[PDB]
């Protein structure tokens, strides 16, 4: 059982930890840190995809192009916030 | 080995596509929206490990602990991102430790 799976998470914390372990943000990272990064990582690419699914869906299509994305982040207030403009 | 010619992997890629796949398996996404959201998850990553490098290290701690990311995501994400993020990392912290 991977530690993903033990959190509840399709995102890959084994992953995230050797990312936060080799880029040297501290002399040690907790067990727990890159179970939170994980889900909020796996959150926010949640939310815009759901957003951007939302935005091809209304738009009469099944796959997501890159002006979905882009409407998507332009209409969210705070993604917009978050992620400037694609 | 992974030579200097071949195509770099995009680290979160399988993944957004199997989060994709829970919530509606049918829509599918395109190879560029794959790249562009991959490079947000990535954008996001750097900026929340770096404010949790500096709190630690304003803190005065060594490690950086699950305690660190929260208040980062919450000095990095807007509003209500950041509550239900925070709600998100808890409930995640806690079901792997039990």
Same mark, same amino acid.
């Given at each position: &059982? !991977?530690?993903?799976?033990?959190?509840?998470? =399709?995102?890959?914390?084994?992953?995230?930890?050797?990312?936060?372990?080799?880029?040297?943000?501290? &002399?040690?990272?907790? !067990?727990?840190?890159? $179970?939170?990064?994980?889900?909020?990582?796996?959150?926010?690419?949640?939310?815009?995809?759901?957003?951007?699914?939302?935005?091809?869906?209304?738009? #009469?299509?099944?796959?997501?192009?890159?002006?979905?994305?882009?409407?998507?982040?332009?209409?969210?207030?705070?993604?917009?916030?978050?992620?400037?403009? $694609? | 080995?992974?030579?200097? /010619? #071949?195509?770099? #992997?995009?680290?979160? /890629? @399988?993944?957004?596509?199997?989060?994709?796949?829970?919530?509606?398996?049918? =829509?599918?996404?395109?190879?560029? !929206?794959? @790249?562009?959201?991959?490079?947000?998850?990535?954008?996001?990553?750097?900026?929340?490990?770096?404010?949790? /490098?500096?709190?630690?290290?304003?803190?005065?701690? @060594?490690?950086?602990?699950?305690?660190?990311?929260?208040?980062?995501?919450?000095?990095?994400?807007?509003?209500?991102?950041?509550?239900?993020?925070? @709600?998100?990392? =808890?409930?995640?912290?806690? #079901?792997?430790?039990?």
């Amino acid at each position: &059982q !991977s530690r993903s799976a033990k959190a509840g998470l =399709t995102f890959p914390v084994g992953r995230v930890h050797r990312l936060l372990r080799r880029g040297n943000y501290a &002399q040690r990272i907790g !067990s727990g840190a890159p $179970v939170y990064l994980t889900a909020v990582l796996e959150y926010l690419a949640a939310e815009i995809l759901e957003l951007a699914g939302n935005a091809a869906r209304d738009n #009469k299509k099944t796959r997501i192009i890159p002006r979905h994305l882009q409407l998507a982040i332009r209409n969210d207030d705070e993604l917009n916030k978050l992620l400037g403009n $694609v | 080995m992974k030579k200097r /010619s #071949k195509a770099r #992997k995009e680290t979160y /890629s @399988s993944y957004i596509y199997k989060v994709l796949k829970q919530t509606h398996p049918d =829509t599918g996404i395109s190879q560029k !929206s794959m @790249s562009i959201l991959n490079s947000f998850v990535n954008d996001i990553f750097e900026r929340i490990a770096t404010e949790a /490098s500096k709190l630690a290290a304003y803190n005065k701690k @060594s490690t950086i602990s699950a305690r660190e990311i929260q208040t980062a995501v919450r000095l990095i994400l807007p509003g209500e991102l950041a509550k239900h993020a925070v @709600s998100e990392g =808890t409930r995640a912290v806690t #079901k792997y430790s039990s």
